[PDB]
Structure formats: structure tokens, C-alpha cells
Amino acid sequence: ARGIVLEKIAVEAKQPNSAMRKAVRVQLIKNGKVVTAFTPGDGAINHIDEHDEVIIEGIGGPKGGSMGDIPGIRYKVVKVNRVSLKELVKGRKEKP
Amino acid sequence: GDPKRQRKKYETPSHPWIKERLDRERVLKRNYALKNKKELWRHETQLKEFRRRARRLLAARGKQAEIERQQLLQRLYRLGLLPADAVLDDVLSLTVEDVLERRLQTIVYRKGLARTMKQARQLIVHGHIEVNGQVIRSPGYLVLREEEDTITYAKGSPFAKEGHPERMVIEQAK
Amino acid sequence: AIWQGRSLKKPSGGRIILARKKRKRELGREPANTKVGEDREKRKIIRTYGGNRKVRLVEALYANVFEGGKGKKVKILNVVENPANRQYARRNIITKGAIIETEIGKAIVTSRPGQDGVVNAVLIK
Amino acid sequence: ARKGPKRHLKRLAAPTSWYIHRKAYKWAVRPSPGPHSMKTSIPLIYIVRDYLGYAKTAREARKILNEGKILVDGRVRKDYKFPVGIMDVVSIPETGEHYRVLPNRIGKLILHPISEEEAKLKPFRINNKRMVKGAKVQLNLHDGSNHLVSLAEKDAYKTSYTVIMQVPERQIVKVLPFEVGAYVFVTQGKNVARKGKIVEVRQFPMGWPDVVTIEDENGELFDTLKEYAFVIGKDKPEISL
RNA sequence: GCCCUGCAGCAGGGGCCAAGGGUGGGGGUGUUCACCCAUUAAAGGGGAACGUGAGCUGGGUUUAGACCGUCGUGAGACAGGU
RNA sequence: AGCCGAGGGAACUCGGCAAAUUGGCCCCGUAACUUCGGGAGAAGGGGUGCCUGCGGGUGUGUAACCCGCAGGUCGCAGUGAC
């Protein structure tokens, strides 16, 4: 699914782990519904601005849902303005 | 409904990372100079089809079952895997190494036309080998029993010359 | 339009939804209400499904009356006792099974004049 | 939704009784109506182009047919959609060739070569009898054709007998009756192209058809439908098979 | 119709002459008043026995009937409500 | 004390005061809620005259009373006034 970014946020990891997982709120262009999605990588959140368009897929978990120590996040970011987060995080390509 | 698409003629393994199987297949690949595991798997699949046919036909009643028994035995004879006085239980004693013996690359190495399996492969692919008069460029052709003694260098081919240097080197082994 | 093709209820009482438009070959036409005429008799010629013909009789004056082999052509007076409807003897409407008065007595109609184009009858005793 | 009759035939939907490569092209020739049924006949162009080989393309075949060089039961035929069927005689005089159309044991149509003396006769099975105006008798035959006979000679003809005729002129000779020692050839069914001698006939009630029991050369007995049993002789084939 | 201005114009603010003409329609409330709505050049205010019941109306103004609350032993009361 | 009133339709008034609207019979159809008895004629919709002919119930009955159908025809309007 395609969406637009509204706000960057952070979520607390469940105990006994301790960390702030970076995330972003996304409004879906299909129906206007708002969901939360995770940004994987070290520094991925530095490459995402507001009002950017983003591609959303599943995070990969039991029964098509949540994963690991993340509470209540079901989705994951793949693309930013038609560019791969993996390549952005490494440093090959540049965000347009 | 739906129409049928073309399907693969090989089957992959059930578990990918089992050590005994990996060792066996590594040995085979290395020794017969295969490029991938697809080839080994497709020869394994040939053998498995023969075996399944024999299992189905064994202790069955009717006219078509008899016809198909005789067809299967004739085909294995013609391919060079069983003799003529062979019974249907002898099909269940075959191994993949027989099917690997029956391919061009192996036969060209075993006759002495090449020093090695990889050299045999290159000869075939570059077009230096003839079977029953016809150039064949596929190193997995599965030579038939009555084509084996007709395998030679192609008529128009450097190695046809009794004095080619690489052919001298090749013959020096024998 | 007179469709004449299929019922919209099942024998159980359930509703049927027609899953297609009406086809031209299903249709019918209006009845000829053959009446006893006064001066002239009228016929219509009708073109039918395979390029074929029918003849509708619209006003009748004469009749062919039969009495044991022999036939006579005569004139139609009053219609008496059409058992297919009460209003038809009053409106002087002729159909098969109607009883008629002729110069030579009472006769029962044996033909279908909206399909055949003639009025044939058998004399009563 | 179709609003009228078909004018096209897809090659995968063509009859089984044809020798035809079903996957090579999309379309096949659709047969025009005529002497036989679609399940017992093939167009002329397939004979001229595929079965014999005197042409490679349909234009060449059509030129051959329009020049007037193929005869069927002794009559010139120029339509490439004309259907040829069982017992028909195909003749080419520029070559001297003469064939009879028959079925295989699989159920397919083949050409059996014959001589010029036998290319003058054709048998017909009588399928029905009618009275027509003038108190005359019409015989309705197996290829859909019709022949007239008189009252006085009406009892000599019945609805599973066979009549041998000179074909272009249609003169009768050698009526053959359905009997219990008659020699029979089978035209349809599982036992197509088997032959032998009638042994027995059984009838059934309420519209179900009649069955015939036959004895072949080797002595094997078998069964088929009376309407599938084609009489060709009294004890020996009047024609070659 | 004129004067001054922290009066560029369009406008504003403050003052002088001037009472000849205009100053209306609706919503809730018994209301005058006040509040609100849409228009309007603007929708000024006062006096005449708070102009006008031998002109109309009678919604309000606790006569006689009745209910609630509160006060009072009680009969009863309330510049309280209905 | 009574009759009519173009275009608007409660802007009147404390308040639709007063006036208007509906209206008889037959057929269809009928909400919430309910102490299951009702609500209910709920609401809402169609039809209705004259003449010509056919039929039914009870009856001994072209005696008498009651119940249906079809057709033709006139009018702005047929419980045409009451």
C-alpha cells in the first residue's frame, strides 16, 4: 500500500528489552485510514521527512501480525519517494 | 477452468541443508564435472520415473499392463541400462551413476577422445564431436546402445587431423 | 407487448428473476374478435415467424354448414350460446364451439376463424 | 448470445472421423449441408489437398475443382465445401483413378482403390418408404437421396434392404434383402468396419431400436444396431472391401 | 448646508446652523427595556393624567377554588412559584 | 346575523381565538407501545350517477326483501342538495 507520512514517532520495547523503535504514522490513499509503520535500519528515520509518500508491506509475524518485541505494529516501510530504504541506509542512492 | 502450463522435469529436495546428501552430491558433481545441481536432479528424476513405473506395473492384471512391461524393458535395453534377459525387479537395482554413465561427456572421456571431463564438455559445446554422422552440442544427450561405436571427431574439425598438437597430447595419455 | 414466454413464479410459490431480455420469438398478438357483419366481410393477412401466412377473419357474413356429408353455404344471423364467455353472445362474437342461427337452423362451429379464415359448422338435430 | 446460424468451424471442434492436424491452425472448413451428415462425411478440399496430395494450397485445389476434374458418384463437383461420405466413389479420369470412401476400425474415413468396372455401381440402404401423390412410392435412402417405384412393385422393397444402382443415370439392379444369411458391413459404433453374416434379429418395446447378431470369418459372434448393419451381399460381397 | 483634524483619496473623529420629511419588518418572553436575524439612506430619542379602557383587548397584576416547597403546636401565612 | 374573494399561506396574536379543511357506504392496507383485552375508523390508498341486459340466496311464486357481473352513455363535479 501507498501512503503519506503524517508524524514521526517512537515506541518502547517490551520488557526485559530496553530500546526506542522508530516509527511513522501513515495515511492510506486507498481509504484514508491511518496506520503505524516501522522503519528498519540504523538511521532509517533520518531519511524520512513529513508529507513524503511511502510504500507499506507486512512486517512478518505469527498469523500475519506483530513481530518480536514491538508492541502493536503490523507494517513496515519499503520505499521512500520511489527509492529503497536499504539503498538509502547503505548510502548508494539519494532521496529525491 | 484453467489451462495447463508447462512444468519442470526435475524435482528439488525436501530439506536443503542435510549433510549426508550434500556430501554425496558434492562428490558426484565434482567427479562428473556438472555445472549445477539441476542436471543431477533431472537424472535422478528420470530414474525415479522408471522405478515408479515398475512399482505400479508389478503384480497388475490385464493386457495393457503386459504391453507396458515389455515397452519399459525394451526402452531400458535400448538406452543401455539393462540387458535383454532382464526381469522387472532388475529395474529397482539401478542407481543414478548408471544414468550419469550414459551421457555424452562421460562416454567421450571414457573412450579416450579427451583427457578430462571438462575438456570433453568443451569439445562437445564447440562442435568437435559427431554421433551416427550428426553433430550434437548437448553434453547430456544420453547416448543409445547402438550409437556408441559411431562416436568420433566431426569430419570438418581440427582434431580430425592425425597431427594436431592437442590431439597428440590427448592420445599421449592412452 | 404480449410476451407469452414463461411464468415468474415457481409451483412452490417462489419468485423467479428473468435472467435475460425478452426474445422476439416468444411474443404473441391480439385476438380477432370475429363479429357478425352487416354489409362486407373483412380479412387480414398476417406474416408469421418463418415467412409464413395466417388469415384473420374480422367480420363474417356467411358460413359453411355440414349435414352428413353434404355442404351448404348460408348466411349468419344471431349468435346463440357461446360457452367460452358470457359477453360474447351479446357482442355477437364467433369462436369455436359457438352455436349460431342460419337460414337452415342451428349449427355448432367447428373451425377457428382467427387462424383459418373461414366459418365451418355442423348442423344440430 | 447468438442471433443466427454459424458460418465458422474451429479446428479443435472438428469431427473425429477426419484425418486433420488439429493444432496447426485455428480454423477449419465448415461443411455445407448436403448428401451425408457431418459425422459421416468430409469436404472435397481435404481429399484433394491432404488425402491424395495433388495440391498444396486451397487456391490450387479450388482451381482443380473449377476446371472440372473431380467426379463424385459420376457427377462433376466444383464446390470445395461439398461433403463426401460412406460408399461414395471418387474418380479422376485424367489419371484413371477410382476410390471408394469407407471407415476404418478406429472410425476414420479412408479411400480404398477400386477398378473402373466397380466404379460404376453404388449401393444404397433404404431408410424409409412413403406414399406420394399419384399413388406412387418414394424410397428415402441412406445418403438422403430419393427414388420413385410403382405400386405393383412395392413389396420388393423394404426399409433395411439395399439397392445397387448405376450412379450417374440411377438405374436399379440387384436388390439385396435383409435376411439371416446376408453378408453385412458395419458403418458406425464400436464394431465399425467388421463384417460377417447375420445370425439373429431382436426387437424391443417402447421406441428402443432393434439389435442384430452377426458371425465373422473366424467364428466370433458380435452384436450391433440394425441401422448400423449395411447389407452388401447374399453370401459374398458384391463389392470389394 | 458648513468649520477644525494626528483631514492624501475612500473613509473616520470632534463641533456649528437646521425639527421641513423619514426613522421600517421578524424570533423567544405578559412584558416596557434589553438580546438576536435578515434587509436598510438610517432603521434617533422624549412630552401630551408614565397621551389615548363613557375606543377595543384582557396576556400580566396571588378576591372567592386548587397543588408544590418553606415557615408555624395549630387555625393559617409567603413584598415564592404554578 | 350570513355568502364569495386574485396571488401568498399563520408573516396575525399571550395563544391558529374564529373560520376553513375532513366527512356516508364497499374493497385494500394498517406503526410505536401494551395490563395481550387494546391502541384502531391508527395512518394511508382506490371506487361510487343514469340506461340496457345477465346471474345468485331464502321462497310455491317474473309475490316480496337482500347480494354480485358485464356493457353503453352524460357532466367541471355522481354520499352531486340534505
Added chain:
RNA sequence: GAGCCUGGGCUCCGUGAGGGGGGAGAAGUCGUAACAAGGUAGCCGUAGGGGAACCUACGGCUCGAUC
């Protein structure tokens, strides 16, 4: 016989002053009902009572210990 108008019958959807429960959450308070005879043995059903875990009565179970 479209389409317009009108009174109808189901379904889905979108909002509402104020009210009601549930689920998660390094970490706010009041007590300590349950596990030992858990400090009055525990539990079922019904009814009444109480800031809250809870208490009491009638009838039942042992999935209850000691002499």
C-alpha cells in the same frame, strides 16, 4: 412501459451532549481475599449487605488437614 412524485420494507454506512464496560502500559495509592489448618478450611448454587479485594445466612462437594 421508461421516468418523476408519494407512503412504504431490509441493509450497510457517517456523525452525537452524556454514560458503560474491556485490554495493554519501567513505575502512583488503600488494604492483604487466595496458595501451609495461609492465621475465620476452601469451593458450587441462591439471596441480602459493603471504599475494594470481600462478609453473612440456607442447602451441597472434598478438588480438606489434625487427634
Added chain:
RNA sequence: AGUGGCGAAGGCGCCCGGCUGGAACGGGUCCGACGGUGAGGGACGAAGGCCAGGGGAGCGAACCGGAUUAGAUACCCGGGUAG
């Protein structure tokens, strides 16, 4: 008075008399497969609670007091309405 007995279960204990339901044993008695289970459906069904009419000794939810207790809306004690 029981590790006892009867009853489909719930549940049933002073004596005597009357009316009635079911089971076991014994049986060269009668009928001659009439049987098993049973959706839906019906009948019975501890205590407690409700309606109407009576009755009310003892016990005793609620409630009212006295002690204990950091606190006691509980356990203990004395009374007592429904039941």
C-alpha cells in the same frame, strides 16, 4: 443405625391402619422378535427466591448494640425482621 436398604434421579428413618408404584428369586405357565438408541417434544426436579391465604417455639440474612483492633463496615458476645 451399618462398609446397611428402597428409589430414574432429586431424595426417603417414632408406632398402627387403609390405598397404591416398581424390582429380585422360583417356574417343562402364556404371547411369539413385540427389540436398542433417541433429534425435535414432554414429565419430574435440593436449597433459596416470588404470588395468595394461615401460623410462628427454636434458629436466624438485613438491622441494632458491646468488645477486639493501627483501622473493623469481619471473625467473638448479647438481641432480632424476612425466612
Added chain:
RNA sequence: AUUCCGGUUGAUCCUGCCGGAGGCCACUGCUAUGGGGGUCCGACUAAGCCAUGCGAGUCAUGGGGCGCGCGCGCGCACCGGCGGACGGCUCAGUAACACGUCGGUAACCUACCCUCGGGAGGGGGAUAACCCCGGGAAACUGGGGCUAAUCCCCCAUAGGCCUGAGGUACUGGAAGGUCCUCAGGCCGAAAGGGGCAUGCCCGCCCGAGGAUGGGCCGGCGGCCGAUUAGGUAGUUGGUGGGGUAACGGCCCACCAAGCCGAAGAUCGGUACGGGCCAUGAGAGUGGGAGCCCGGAGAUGGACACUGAGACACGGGUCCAGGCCCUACGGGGCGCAGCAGGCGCGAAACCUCCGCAAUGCGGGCAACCGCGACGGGGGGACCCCCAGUGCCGUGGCAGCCACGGCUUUUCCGGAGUGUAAAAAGCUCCGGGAAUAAGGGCUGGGCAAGGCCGGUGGCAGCCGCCGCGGUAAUACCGGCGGCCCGAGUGGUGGCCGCUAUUAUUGGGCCUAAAGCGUCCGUAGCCGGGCCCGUAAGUCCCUGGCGAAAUCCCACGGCUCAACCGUGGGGCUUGCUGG
């Protein structure tokens, strides 16, 4: 391969769910050398919207005119005939005799085609083109004069239909169905046209049959819901009629009270059906877009003309809805046909060449046309076969170097091929030159106890769990493992799962025996004899399209593919 591995405890055996490991379909990240074959490429979201141009014609052997040429020919529009009802596209609606299979119509229609048997007589008329005037912005359209036919009309005769009375020739399982005779009536043919030549070819009308293509009927079979229980009023049937091509409440008048249903009616939800497909050891579970058969639709919804056939996919009339031209008086169009653009959305190609092959229509034919079809172009659609070097020596433990060989692929050419091209194939010249990545590396699970960095923050993580300053688990370097022109990520179906259990599970304490009894339907039912043959078993006849599945042989270098044969499939139906 008829399979197991990790996870609840301080340790153990169980129950039970989550996860791993395999296959197919769709989207996507990174990366990519070649040839061949195939039924792949806006189905999921919008059966949403547009511009330009194409997709259906043909006949001088039907007729008149005009022009260009030389009484012969070539062309232009016109009248006339046949076709335009096929092909192609899509799956909105539909739970239905729509579909499948077996049967039936003795209750029906059918232009083009085949066979047989018979016919072509006598008379009339008009009008398009053309000429003289025009009207209107266009779309379109008026008047006057003239003229042909296979155009149109009339008369007759053949012929057709209805009814009544007789006879008994035919078929069939079964007849007033056909035939013969009589009678009373209604309707009512035809182009003796064209070509050749001194009889033949192409056509016209009537009759009998067949074929082809359809209409109608029946028996059997195929989803979910009871937090949908009563439904039906021309409704069920009868008598008599109308209408239809034809049977029939299809419609009408009259008479009755029937029809469906707890073995699930009615109502609602969802959906085109099948042949087939995916998966699995199988039993089974799930799907049904692309190829074939059938059905339905052409902005939504209705109604008609012409014709053998339409209520018409490139035609007509109206209402709604939208869009466009306009001199403002009025006119025109719906892209679910091909190519192209927009939008919607995670998500889908050239405004290309040709009628040479297969077929269709027209034509005596010769031939004409066809966005069907064929051919190429674009695209990590599916499948097959290959490449990215080989040999020897020295050195290490796959690499560097040395010396050689080859040319599938690369570059450049000549022929063949092709409708024309292109690719492919044969040959020639040069030259190791031109061509590897993706994921993983604590355990499940193959592979490092090696370096630098960071430091319960940053980050990893299908599940178990790592990281808190000595990190085999984060980031990176170096090594190594798996697969390999591919390899990873997300979602769906199958399997895993004996977690739906017929094969084949469980209910004292783990989820689970109604509180107990009586009994309705249904399911299960003791022993012997006689009969029957419905179930059941064997044998034989007629059906269950082709494609798709298995086997062998043969043709493309083998193969994929195609062909020839033998079996199977269609869950079954029917005569003996």
C-alpha cells in the same frame, strides 16, 4: 521420503497451540550473456473517461447513364441482388431446466446445399441516376421534365390451408400423420431472365424428403446461513376458448380448493457453469480469468421496423444521465472491436507490416476485401538447451606466472531463408578476447570462537532469544556455506495437521457425557424354510466432443514441441 525439528520446568513425562523446513500463483528489492517452443501480458481497483484513424463488402454472366480510350476495352457514382444476425470483446446480472449427462417432440420453424418429381402463360406501372431551378452554418433536404431492369403490381392456371363424410395403399413400438374418392369454401406462384454458340453453362417457381442451424419438454446431478418457520391467490388443478411456428395459466371466462415445507420451504448472502487446474503417498482440501463447449451483455431502462433468422456488437424511437459542434434557428456521440492517451490503483506492451498461409463473405469464374488471422516490436510470464574457457609446467594451498589449443557466445561479411524483412541455418576472417550475482554465517540449519568499531543507547529477532564495555547473535573487513542468470522480501491456496479424524481423533483429573427419565421421526436390529429379483455381482450392445493425462515409435542437432497408434479421464446414464 506414507519423515520430523525449536519453544511452558530447578529437572520430567503429557495435552495443546505458535513457529521452521516443501510446492504453485500475484506484487516488489538487488542483479542479468544467447538461442528455441508455448493456449502469457488492465480479470483482482473504475461493465470508469477521451482524440485521431481503421475494423464489411462484393457482382459488367441483373439495368440504365457518363467519362477515358481503341462497333472492343478501362474507370465514376446510381438503381438492383446477396451478405452485413458470423467473426471479435467482456463476465455486470443470474442459485435458474442457466449448466452437465441420458432421452423426447406422433407438439415446431429453417435462406444458402443434396436428391427426385414437375412448371415458366397473358398484361400493366412507377421511379433513382441525368437535365432546368434551388433552400440551409452545417446535419440534411423541396419542385418540375425523362428513362430501364433478375424493381413493383394485376389476371389465369398449378398449388396451400380449414371442415364434414367415406376407403384402407404406407411407415412406425404405437396414427386419420401420409395416400385414394366425394363435398362446401377461403388464400394464391413464377425472372424462359442472362452468356455462348448453331445444344451447353449460370440463374427463377411449386411439391416430397434429407441435411444444416435452432426453439420447446422431461428424468438424474452440482454453494453457505434457523440470531430466516410458515409461504402461495392466476396461486394448484379442471371445463371451454384465444393466441403462438408450436405443447403449455402463456392469456381469458366459469367451477372447485388445491400447491410447497424441519429429508429445510420461503427469505437473505455469495457467485457465470463445465471440460479442467493447484496441491498431497493416497483418501482428500481448495480454485474455476487467458484454450474448447455452452450461457448472458453492449452508458442504465424500456419499445419496435426490415428480414429465413434480431427486439440487432459498426442500425432505429423515447426517458434518465453525461460529453461535443453551432452563425443560437438547430444538430451530433457512448473506446466491455485494434492500436493510442487519462485516471483508479501494489499491479499489466507498437497510434507497426501483410492478405503470402488458415478460413469467412460475395462472384460462373478470374479475383476482391477482412485491426479475424499471420508477422515482427516491447516485457526477469511458463518450459527446454547452453555460455561466461581448456590443457600442461613451476609455486602454494582455488590462485600468479610461463607456454600452448579452441571459438558455443562477440565483432565483420557472402549465400539460403522470408509476402518483404529480421532472426535462424551453411561457409569465411579476426580474436581468451565480450559476459556473476543474491542471500546467509548462535540454535533449529550447511557454514568463523578471526580482526576494527560501538556500547540496555544504537540496533538485531518468522519462533527461541542477543545486546547492559572482553559482543562467535549489532555495524563493517577478511574468510567460508547454499543456490546460481538468478537470488531475497510481502500477501494468498495446498501440505505440514490423526489441529475436522470414512480410511483416521478425543470427553474421571488436561477443552468436552444434557440434572434425570418417557418417547416421535430417522439410524441399528435374533434363528430356519419358500418365493421375488429392488439393492449387489458377471457378460454383452448404445452414449459420455476435442484439447489436457500415461506409454512406445517417428519428424525438428537431442530436448521442450508436433504427428501416428494403444490406454486412461469425463465422479456416470441407458437397452438386454
